[PDB]
């Protein structure tokens, strides 16, 4: 042995492909869940309302 992932740049090749590789899409943000919630801040919010 041997070796392990040989090319230029830095991380070289990972997985390719063959093309045909339609790639798709991608959307996000549809459900939230937190431990350790943030403040507000109310300052920004007031200013917005004003505008």
């Amino acid at each position: 042995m041997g070796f392990e992932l040989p090319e230029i740049f830095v991380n070289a090749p990972f997985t390719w492909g063959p093309p045909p590789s339609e790639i798709e899409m991608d959307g996000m943000k549809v459900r939230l869940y937190q431990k350790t919630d943030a403040i507000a801040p109310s300052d920004w919010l007031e200013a917005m309302l004003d505008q």
């Binding site: 041997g2 070796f3 992932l5 040989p6 090319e7 090749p13 390719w16 492909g17």
Partner: protein
């Protein structure tokens, strides 16, 4: 298996045929210096053929020759290897069934054995083969695996080659596939592939066996389990060109042109072009352009790259193929303009066309009583076919 990256560059760049000037930093990781004999030297022979020659080749020759006369005298701590080197009889014997290991160890054996190259090359291969099988050994998974690769590499003198052909499709394919958790990664696959190609298609080098064109087609490819991802990464233009040539030479699996077309496009990621054009036009199907291209390509390359060997066969297959397609439907087309192109008088051309027809790939009769080739119907009998299918 495996390796080396500089060596790899020397390899493929020469094959492509753009230039040689290339380094090959070395030696690495065949070994230093252990079996066989040397990898670099084989590359040098190819380079010499391409284009004269140069300082690296001289260095390689020196490296191969010695270290060292004294070491050569010293080797062997007993108690076989003899009649020149090996003990042919012993090699045969270590299967049937011998498998439960006398003494134990061939650890000191390896130390004594290691020497090498010189190249000497048939004998060297024979010795390696003998070591491989004990079977129980101990020592080792990886060391043995490296050994298998070396056997595959050289010598390609045919009894060694046929043995190695069997070994490649049992061993190497299995090894690449997982499990074992997790091996073998991109470099190993690429290296293995390069060695297989060298061992038979026909670089320059040497290739053809009987027949293992088939082997090349079979492995890179074929869907249970798949890769072809490996072939694509990271950027094997020369290999693709070679595959196109191989497909034409073979002239069928079953599926032939279609498979080749899919492989080829791979539009511009790395794409070498003279063979590729011949195949890509032929499958698509234009008949004027393809016909012209095949002589031009044949004459252009060659180029370097002699062997010659196979390419006469390739030229014949290609001509036959273009014509077979041209006939099929289409007409009900003649025949004088076919004869003029392929280039001898009319009767020789007629018999050549008749040989395409006689393979049961077409239904046709040739009128030599008006010089017309007539095709059947059969492609198309419509209602009748449906009645048969139902009943």
């Amino acid at each position: 298996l495996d390796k080396h990256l500089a060596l790899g560059l020397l390899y493929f760049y020469d094959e492509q045929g753009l230039d040689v000037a290339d380094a090959l930093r070395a030696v690495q990781a065949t070994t230093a210096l252990t079996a066989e004999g040397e990898v670099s030297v084989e590359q040098e022979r190819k380079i010499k053929e391409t284009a004269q020659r140069a300082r690296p080749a001289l260095d390689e020759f020196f490296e191969k020759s010695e270290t060292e006369n004294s070491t050569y005298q010293f080797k062997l701590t007993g108690s076989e290897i003899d009649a020149l080197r090996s003990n042919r009889e012993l090699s045969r014997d270590v299967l049937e069934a011998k498998g439960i290991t006398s003494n134990v160890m061939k650890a000191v054996m390896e130390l004594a054995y290691l020497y090498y190259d010189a190249a000497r090359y048939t004998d060297a291969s024979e010795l390696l083969s003998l070591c491989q099988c004990v079977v129980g050994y101990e020592i080792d998974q990886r060391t043995l695996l490296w050994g298998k690769l070396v056997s595959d590499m050289c010598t390609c003198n045919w009894p060694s080659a046929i043995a190695a052909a069997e070994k490649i499709r049992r061993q190497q394919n299995a090894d690449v596939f997982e499990e074992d958790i997790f091996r073998v990664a991109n470099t190993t696959t690429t290296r293995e592939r390069a060695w297989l190609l060298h061992w038979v298609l026909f670089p320059f080098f040497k290739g053809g066996n009987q027949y293992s064109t088939h082997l090349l087609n079979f492995v890179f490819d074929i869907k249970t389990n798949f890769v072809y991802q490996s072939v694509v990464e990271t950027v094997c233009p020369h290999y693709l060109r070679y595959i196109c040539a191989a497909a034409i030479l073979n002239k069928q699996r079953r599926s032939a042109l279609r498979s080749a077309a899919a492989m080829v496009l791979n539009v511009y990621e790395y794409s070498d072009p003279i063979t590729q054009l011949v195949n890509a036009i032929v499958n698509r199907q234009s008949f004027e352009d393809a016909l012209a291209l095949l002589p031009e390509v044949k004459s252009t390359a060659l180029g370097d790259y002699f062997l010659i060997l196979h390419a006469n066969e390739i030229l014949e297959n290609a001509r036959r193929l273009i014509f077979a397609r041209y006939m099929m439907t289409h007409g009900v087309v003649s025949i004088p303009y076919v004869a003029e192109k392929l280039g001898t008088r009319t009767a020789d051309a007629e018999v050549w066309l008749a040989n395409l027809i006689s393979e049961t790939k077409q239904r046709a009769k040739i009128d030599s009583v008006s010089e017309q080739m007539i095709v059947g119907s059969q492609a198309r009998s419509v209602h009748q076919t449906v009645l048969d299918k139902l009943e």
